[PDB]
């Protein structure tokens, strides 16, 4: 009566280790990743359903620890700048500036070690205001002198995002859901199977989500709990909004030897006038896109609810501004110029600041020093979504953001990992 079958098409939810596939020694060691399967076959599954939960998806946790581990490994074999944490003697940069840049740059002189242990040299460099702390012309310290070590990033290792594909080991499969009305949880009927996902760009940002995937059928609004004001709301656009960012100053760079075999890259002088860094967003596009978000957002509050976007909530720059990583520079842009409307029933210019000393993972640990880059940086990118948080007829939303194990969460919401279980039994009418 008992017949044993092998190769039965069933599975259980499971957690396993995923490995990557992809495609000059960049920050994510993509040359160490296996080659992709070109033209992989996607297999649609007819007459199946499955349940998903993007807020409990362990693929997010692996992407989180993979990116952090890679960041730290890549910065490990790089020159330390410990000898640079000295008393600095600084004055203001005033010779060729606009008023908006007055006080933004400082000219600092200091006594630094030469390759010979017994000799010192007088050198100077420029620093941005945000990296320099006054002690009492005036004496200064770098911002991390009493908190952590500063390591200079290696100049040969780039940071631009490179798509990384996550692949399951044999015996496991990835279920991708196509239901275009899926809100992040529960039954999601249009399921297909892939062995390895498409590439995801490991972009790190706050408030605005850049260079991600787009929605199609509608703007999607997803949250763990809509009525819980302690949770974030992820909004995915079905159209991109284009932005253009610039340095715009023409920078120079010089090397200082600080010991045998090691050098520090100092910001040199500036060619031409000094102007403030900034980002432009097309105004009409932003105006229309925001209206689409509101129409859809109202479905969870009522047709008589007024939606206001107020302003940024306040706090440290890392959580109040738009953290933008581009061209090898770290930008902190003022988004109050975007989120300024109330909804009832040209270009926008966002002034932006630059920092060289970066605490990338919002932790106390080794800080990275971004070496200066010569020439002029020009960045073009797509806003694919945004993060909102919510504070009796008017609801208030704010950019919020700042959370890690987010952003990537908007790319991995479509996937679940399952374990294949080939054996099973059933009754029939045979005997040996």
């Amino acid at each position: 009566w008992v017949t044993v079958y092998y190769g039965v098409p069933v599975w259980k939810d499971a957690e396993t280790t995923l490995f990557c596939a992809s495609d000059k020694h960049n920050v994510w060691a993509t040359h160490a990743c296996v080659p992709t399967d070109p033209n992989p076959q996607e297999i649609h599954l007819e007459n199946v359903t499955e349940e998903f939960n993007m807020w409990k998806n362990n693929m997010v946790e692996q992407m989180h620890t993979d990116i952090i581990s890679l960041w730290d490994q890549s910065l490990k074999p790089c020159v330390k700048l410990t000898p640079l944490c000295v008393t600095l003697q600084c004055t203001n940069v005033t010779n060729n500036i606009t008023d908006d840049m007055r006080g933004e740059l400082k000219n600092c002189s200091f006594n630094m070690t030469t390759e010979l242990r017994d000799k010192k040299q007088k050198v100077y460099s420029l620093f941005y205001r945000l990296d320099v702390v006054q002690i009492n012309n005036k004496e200064y310290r770098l911002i991390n002198c009493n908190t952590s070590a500063i390591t200079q990033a290696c100049p040969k290792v780039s940071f631009e995002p490179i798509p990384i594909h996550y692949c399951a080991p044999a015996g496991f499969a990835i279920l991708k859901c196509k239901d275009k009305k899926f809100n992040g949880t529960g039954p999601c009927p249009s399921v297909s199977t892939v062995q390895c996902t498409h590439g995801i760009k490991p972009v790190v940002s706050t408030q605005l989500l850049l260079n991600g995937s787009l929605a199609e059928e509608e703007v999607m609004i997803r949250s763990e709990n809509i009525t819980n004001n302690a949770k974030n709301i992820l909004v995915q656009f079905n159209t991109p909004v284009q932005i253009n960012c610039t340095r715009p100053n023409n920078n120079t760079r010089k090397s200082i030897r600080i010991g045998p075999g090691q050098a520090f890259y100092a910001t040199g002088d500036i060619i031409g006038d000094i102007r403030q860094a900034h980002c432009n967003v097309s105004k009409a596009t932003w105006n229309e896109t925001l209206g689409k978000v509101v129409k859809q957002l109202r479905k969870h509050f009522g047709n008589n609810t007024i939606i206001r976007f107020a302003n940024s909530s306040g706090g440290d720059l890392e959580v109040t501004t738009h953290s933008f990583n581009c061209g090898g520079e770290f930008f902190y842009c003022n988004t109050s110029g975007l989120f300024n409307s109330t909804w009832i029933s040209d270009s926008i210019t966002l002034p932006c600041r630059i920092k060289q000393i970066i605490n990338m993972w919002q932790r106390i640990g080794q800080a990275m020093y971004a070496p200066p880059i010569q020439g002029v940086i020009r960045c073009v990118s797509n806003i694919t979504g945004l993060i909102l948080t919510r504070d009796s007829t008017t609801e208030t939303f704010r950019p919020g953001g700042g959370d890690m194990r987010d952003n990537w969460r908007s790319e991995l919401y479509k996937y679940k990992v399952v374990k294949i279980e080939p054996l099973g039994v059933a009754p029939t009418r045979c005997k040996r």
Partner: antibody
Amino acid sequence: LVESGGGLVQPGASLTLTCTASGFSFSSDYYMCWVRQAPGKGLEWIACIWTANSISYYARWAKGRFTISKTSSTTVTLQMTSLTAADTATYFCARGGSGDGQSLWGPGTLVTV
Amino acid sequence: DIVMTQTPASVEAAVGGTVAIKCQASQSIRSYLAWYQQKPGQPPKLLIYEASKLASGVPSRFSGSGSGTQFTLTISGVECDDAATYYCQRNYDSYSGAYYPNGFGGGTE
């Protein structure tokens, strides 16, 4: 909305129909769909295009013969090729949206092959 | 791919009596069935969407319900403005994941 085009053609001919917005524009949240109804028949579906990102879907019977596209913020067209006598029908455009049927229908056009 | 059959063909009733029209499918289309009314010479009017919701402009005599693969349109009483055929439209594509108005079954008065 409003519609235009149509007329008498011979088999092997191509004919393009045009439908346009009136009192509205092609904001993201709409589908422009084309359907057909022969004089003695019920409704048949041909194709739908989603305004954002110009994404189309087609009936299998229509594949390779009927092309649907967005040409402007107000205009959507249907290009029919390799027409035969069997394609004589009233053609209609209508506007729908996600999760629903078409709610806005125009007077149709007449195509005779 | 898409199977839609309207079965109670050629049903009519005297004014004051009632009628019902029903459709079946080989694939579930839960809560994604739309009903239309087509009077001669007119484009179809949307009556009911998402199985049970009435469209704006639709008289209270129209109603209906269903789920899965079994759905019905009902008329609470004939008012002599029912001289139309009715159609079933599917608003869900099980292969693409999209929810657009693809495919009809129908033709019953």
